[PDB]
Amino acid sequence: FVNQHLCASHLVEALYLVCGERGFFYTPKT
Amino acid sequence: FVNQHLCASHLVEALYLVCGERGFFYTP
Amino acid sequence: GIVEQCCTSICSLYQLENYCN
Amino acid sequence: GIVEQCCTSICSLYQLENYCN
């Protein structure tokens, strides 16, 4: 079954995808 | 003029109110 | 996330609620 | 933040999306 947690590079790559032209702040600490 | 920003303790307080018994994670 | 969204900028109720859990 | 919502726990698309901007 696919592991459903999104972590580390997979998490940044997901934001990149879903945000599109809006872009995003990636801030892992907080 | 009146401020609509929620920052610091005001932000934590806003999460405490809207989240209610669901709770919430917060880190400054 | 929440600070950029609600503190630097202004957020709506459902944006704030999406941080609960 | 995003690590607790989406990495430690499992987030919805809208929760993930709430992190854009």
The method recorded for this entry reads X-ray
Distances B5 to A30, B11, B16, C19 between C-alpha atoms, Å: 19, 9, 16, 16
Q: How does DSSP classify residue C3?
A: I
- Residues in D closer than 8 angstroms to C2, CB to CB, are 1
For chains A and D, what is the number of CB pairs under 8 angstroms? 50
The amino acid occupying position B28 is P
In single-letter form, the type of residue at position A11 comes to L
How many angstroms separate the first and last alpha carbons of chain C?
A: 15
User: Resolution of this PDB entry, in A?
Assistant: 1.4
CA distances in angstroms from B18 to A22, B8, B21, B24, listed in the order given: 26, 16, 9, 10
**Best mutation target, C14, C15, C18, C20, to test chain D (most D CBs within 10 A):** C18
Report the C-alpha gap between C3 and C19 in whole angstroms: 11
Cα–Cα dist D9/A5, whole Å: 7
Stated as kind and residue range, the H or E segment containing A20 is none
Q: Which residues of A1-30 are buried (b: 16+ CB within 10 A; e: fewer)?
A: eeeeebeeeebeebbeeeeeeeebeeeeee
> Rounded to a whole number, what is the distance in Å from the CA of A18 to chain B's nearest CA?
23
Collapsing DSSP to helix, strand or coil, A24 comes out as strand
